[PDB]
Amino acid sequence: MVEFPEGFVWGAATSGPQTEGNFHKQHQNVFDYWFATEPEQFDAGVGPDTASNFYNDYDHDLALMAQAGVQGLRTSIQWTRLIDDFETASLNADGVAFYNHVIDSMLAHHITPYINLHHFDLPVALYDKYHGWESKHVVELFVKFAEQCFKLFGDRVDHWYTFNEPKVVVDGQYLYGWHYPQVINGPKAVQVAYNMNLASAKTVARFHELCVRPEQQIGIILNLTPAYAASDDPADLAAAEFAELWSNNLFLDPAVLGHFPEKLVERLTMDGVLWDATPTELAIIAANPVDCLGVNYYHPFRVQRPDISPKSLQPWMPDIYFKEYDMPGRMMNVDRGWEIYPQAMTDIARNIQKNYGNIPWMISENGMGVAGEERFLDKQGVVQDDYRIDFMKEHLTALAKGIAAGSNCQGYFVWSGIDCWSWNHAYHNRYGLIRNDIHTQTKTLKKSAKWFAELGERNGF
Amino acid sequence: MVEFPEGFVWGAATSGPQTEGNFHKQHQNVFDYWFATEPEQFDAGVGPDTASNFYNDYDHDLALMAQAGVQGLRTSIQWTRLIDDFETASLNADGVAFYNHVIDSMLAHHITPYINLHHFDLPVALYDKYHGWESKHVVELFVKFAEQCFKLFGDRVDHWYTFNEPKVVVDGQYLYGWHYPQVINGPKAVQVAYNMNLASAKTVARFHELCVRPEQQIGIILNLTPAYAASDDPADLAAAEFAELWSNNLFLDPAVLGHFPEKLVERLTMDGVLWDATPTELAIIAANPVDCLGVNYYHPFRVQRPDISPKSLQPWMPDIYFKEYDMPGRMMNVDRGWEIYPQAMTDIARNIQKNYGNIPWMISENGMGVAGEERFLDKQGVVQDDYRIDFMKEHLTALAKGIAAGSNCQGYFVWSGIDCWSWNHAYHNRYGLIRNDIHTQTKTLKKSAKWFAELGERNGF
Numbered sequence: 008m009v010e011f012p013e014g015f016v017w018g019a020a021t022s023g024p025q026t027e028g029n030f031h032k033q034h035q036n037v038f039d040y041w042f043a044t045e046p047e048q049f050d051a052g053v054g055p056d057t058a059s060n061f062y063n064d065y066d067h068d069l070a071l072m073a074q075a076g077v078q079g080l081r082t083s084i085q086w087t088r089l090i091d092d093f094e095t096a097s098l099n100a101d102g103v104a105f106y107n108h109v110i111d112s113m114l115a116h117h118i119t120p121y122i123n124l125h126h127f128d129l130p131v132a133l134y135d136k137y138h139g140w141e142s143k144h145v146v147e148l149f150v151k152f153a154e155q156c157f158k159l160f161g162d163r164v165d166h167w168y169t170f171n172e173p174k175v176v177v178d179g180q181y182l183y184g185w186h187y188p189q190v191i192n193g194p195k196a197v198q199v200a201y202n203m204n205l206a207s208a209k210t211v212a213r214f215h216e217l218c219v220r221p222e223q224q225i226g227i228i229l230n231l232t233p234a235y236a237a238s239d240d241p242a243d244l245a246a247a248e249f250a251e252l253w254s255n256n257l258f259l260d261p262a263v264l265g266h267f268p269e270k271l272v273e274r275l276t277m278d279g280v281l282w283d284a285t286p287t288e289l290a291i292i293a294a295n296p297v298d299c300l301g302v303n304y305y306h307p308f309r310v311q312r313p314d315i316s317p318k319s320l321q322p323w324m325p326d327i328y329f330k331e332y333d334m335p336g337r338m339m340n341v342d343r344g345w346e347i348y349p350q351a352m353t354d355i356a357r358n359i360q361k362n363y364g365n366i367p368w369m370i371s372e373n374g375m376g377v378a379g380e381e382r383f384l385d386k387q388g389v390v391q392d393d394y395r396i397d398f399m400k401e402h403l404t405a406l407a408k409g410i411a412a413g414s415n416c417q418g419y420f421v422w423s424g425i426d427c428w429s430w431n432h433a434y435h436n437r438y439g440l441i442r443n444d445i446h447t448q449t450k451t452l453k454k455s456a457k458w459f460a461e462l463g464e465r466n467g468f
Numbered sequence: 469m470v471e472f473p474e475g476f477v478w479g480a481a482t483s484g485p486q487t488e489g490n491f492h493k494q495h496q497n498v499f500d501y502w503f504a505t506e507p508e509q510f511d512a513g514v515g516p517d518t519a520s521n522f523y524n525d526y527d528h529d530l531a532l533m534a535q536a537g538v539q540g541l542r543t544s545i546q547w548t549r550l551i552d553d554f555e556t557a558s559l560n561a562d563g564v565a566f567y568n569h570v571i572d573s574m575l576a577h578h579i580t581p582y583i584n585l586h587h588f589d590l591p592v593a594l595y596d597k598y599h600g601w602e603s604k605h606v607v608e609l610f611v612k613f614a615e616q617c618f619k620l621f622g623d624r625v626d627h628w629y630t631f632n633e634p635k636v637v638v639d640g641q642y643l644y645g646w647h648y649p650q651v652i653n654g655p656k657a658v659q660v661a662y663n664m665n666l667a668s669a670k671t672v673a674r675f676h677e678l679c680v681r682p683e684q685q686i687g688i689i690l691n692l693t694p695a696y697a698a699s700d701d702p703a704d705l706a707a708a709e710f711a712e713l714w715s716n717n718l719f720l721d722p723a724v725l726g727h728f729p730e731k732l733v734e735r736l737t738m739d740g741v742l743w744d745a746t747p748t749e750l751a752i753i754a755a756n757p758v759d760c761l762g763v764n765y766y767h768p769f770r771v772q773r774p775d776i777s778p779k780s781l782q783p784w785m786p787d788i789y790f791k792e793y794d795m796p797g798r799m800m801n802v803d804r805g806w807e808i809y810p811q812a813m814t815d816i817a818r819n820i821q822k823n824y825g826n827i828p829w830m831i832s833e834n835g836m837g838v839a840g841e842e843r844f845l846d847k848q849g850v851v852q853d854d855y856r857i858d859f860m861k862e863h864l865t866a867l868a869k870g871i872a873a874g875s876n877c878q879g880y881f882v883w884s885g886i887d888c889w890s891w892n893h894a895y896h897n898r899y900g901l902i903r904n905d906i907h908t909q910t911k912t913l914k915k916s917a918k919w920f921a922e923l924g925e926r927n928g929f
Contacts, residue, residue: 029907029908029909030521030524030908030909031908031909031910032908035907039907042907043907046512046513051507051513052507052512052513052514053513054907056518056906056907056908056909057517057518060491063491063524445517446490446496446500446504446517447490447491447492447493447517448490448491448492449492
């Protein structure tokens with residue numbers, strides 16, 4: 008029935024910090040330091056120090072991933088593992104060697120590399136010295152690190168990305184306490200948002216200057232979940248308008264259109280919390296859009312009025328203009344507390360098609376997490392994750408309507424290939440196609456793994 | 469100024485479960501299952517799943533130990549890693565290759581291998597099915613595993629040990645809650661003590677049927693801390709008399725003399741808690757004493773009369789005869805809670821000389837744990853553990869007096885070579901000549917490492 012374009016890319020996504028372990032890693036990133044000082048904040052006291060042991064198990068991990076039909080693996084290079092001196096971007100000898108092994112072994116196992124340069128993993132040294140992404144100097148050193156990744160690995164890596172979801176670094180580090188250093192400052196968060204867009208653009212710039220070869224392309228990875236209004240009442244549609252500008256156009260528009268959405272920059276100006284920008288910088292943004300887009304989606308987002316007036320005396324946060332809304336009769340993943348709504352896949356495809364030039368794009372993350380998968384092991388220790396196959400079917404179908412309506416969707420990357428470490432939640436929820444018993448680092452394909460191998464061969468289901 | 473016999477061995481000690489991590493291990497031992505189920509029972513939530521990463525980094529680890537002057541290394545083979553099916557002692561192909569890999573790497577780094585067979589690490593599946601060491605069938609299974617160790621590795625391992633401190637298994641599993649399964653039952657513990665003495669003895673027999681060359685010796689590692697009476701008050705002397713029989717003679721006599729100490733068995737019989745033994749079993753125990761003895765010593769032990777009469781009706785426990793005593797004016801390692809008393813080294817040496825035939829013996833464990841050693845890092849990141857050097861000087865001085873009086877001590881093994889995982893205390897206390905930063909598994913010689921290398925080349929200090 009459901010069929011997909013020819014040459015569609017079927018793949019899996021993770022990150023360096025969530026798989027490698029900190030084995031011989033020279034530098035602490037913000038999560039490394041958080042767990043070393045406050046392990047209480049991590050599920051079951053499980054931190055990143057071993058994660059899914061990718062640093063040691065990479066060759067067989069790649070073999071199993073290919074067995075589960077992963078044609079392309081999207082992961083990330085750790086700034087804190089690759090670089091010795093952050094100011095000069097000198098190379099850590101062991102770190103470069105490791106990433107060569109990984110990339111060589113990806114290729115030997117017939118898996119297309121997709122390398123993301125940054126996944127929530129700021130070096131904590133650069134926060135202590137410069138306050139991290141608040142500093143346009145740190146921005147310059149991200150580029151220096153990106154330049155190094157380009158020279159060392161650009162020979163066999165085609166597909167790069169500047170960031171995975173800068174919004175979550177903004178939200179997490181500066182608004183809502185999710186990421187160490189857990190700063191709660193709205194105005195600071197706005198500058199961080201700007202600064203990360205500046206960095207992604209300057210990284211596209213140097214990428215294209217240091218790229219000769221035409222199949223090489225660099226994109227960015229954003230979550231583009233719409234902000235659905237809670238009703239048609241003007242107050243709610245205005246909350247949905249801002250929340251859309253704030254959660255999506257803040258990054259989508261500078262990344263793809265080359266400028267910030269002017270309704271948004273207007274509102275931040277009227278509020279006196281607009282970022283410090285310069286026309287040189289804004290012209291760098293404008294000159295270097297991304298070559299493609301990766302789209303993350305998991306669950307919808309719905310929005311109503313704020314309870315009190317945005318002009319009330321309170322510290323500035325974006326949240327003063329909208330409140331989350333729970334829709335009655337919603338379909339829920341009850342244990343995880345998320346709404347299920349594959350229709351947003353179709354909306355996202357349309358939005359890119361019409362308002363974003365139908366720029367080449369993929370779904371770079373989509374998947375379902377479940378706790379306690381042992382409950383579903385069969386007699387040969389294979390998780391019977393029928394729920395996981397159902398979820399992919401509903402969401403791939405919705406994706407297919409958008410493709411058919413003419414949306415330029417080139418691939419689909421599952422979260423995740425192998426169970427991996429989910430920040431403070433660590434291993435509470437399991438998303439893999441492949442189970443990891445983290446006590447032994449023994450890995451085993453779930454049932455969904457042979458279904459995904461079958462999906463990639465039929466190019467449909 | 470203090471010098472040691474020519475040929476004296478300068479070693480280091482650990483165990484498999486405290487170093488390897490559980491990477492790709494087939495079976496859980498009781499500590500693995502304990503951590504998997506009750507991680508809150510372990511310091512900072514650190515369990516044995518990674519420990520000191522010895523599975524992955526054994527080659528560079530032994531090179532560090534070679535640098536720190538380890539001429540001989542004693543560690544353990546995990547039953548739960550070597551054996552596929554416990555009933556048959558069939559081999560796990562991957563576990564056999566690992567231990568081959570570490571032994572050969574030991575020789576390649578000019579480290580003499582000293583292989584212990586068991587270090588608190590009973591397969592949990594054998595506790596579930598048979599109640600572990602309470603089962604003489606489990607005794608037989610242990611011998612079939614020992615036999616496999618000898619046939620696979622005897623060709624290049626000369627020095628074997630049946631057990632590390634079986635008393636800690638008896639106390640830990642059956643008396644005081646220290647080890648999972650946390651059974652509290654005197655009578656059972658008495659039987660376990662017997663069963664492990666019998667298992668050790670059948671192993672020696674099997675070893676002597678399979679050992680070729682005359683350099684091949686097998687022994688047992690016991691803690692021989694004396695039980696010093698609190699005073700000359702007769703009740704205090706009777707408490708030391710029984711504490712000595714129970715904590716030392718219960719294992720020393722069967723292992724070296726071939727029989728259990730008669731006053732103890734008379735005591736256990738009157739109390740109705742004696743073990744089930746058969747004359748055939750006692751005959752094996754009489755005919756297969758060890759070739760040599762490993763002695764562990766850390767802190768002394770003092771005993772006074774019990775608060776209440778041992779005739780009080782209460783569950784039977786060896787403690788109904790003695791209570792620990794705190795000597796006023798004692799010398800203390802205040803943070804660890806242990807008295808410092810090097811003189812016990814000399815007392816121990818005398819006891820072996822006077823009463824145990826001056827059997828060849830070694831100090832197989834001696835060391836000093838300190839918490840938070842990062843507070844003593846110098847400029848170049850080398851721990852300045854002068855305290856650890858002072859500790860070794862004091863105890864080695866006591867040792868040398870014992871040797872000079874004619875005791876047949878042939879080596880000194882420091883606990884530990886590299887910082888290793890200390891059961892529920894995990895890495896709260898560090899004992900190594902070499903630091904392990906357990907977040908990154910990066911290891912670095914301490915100052916004691918250099919002093920110990922120099923100690924071995926001077927054979928004295």
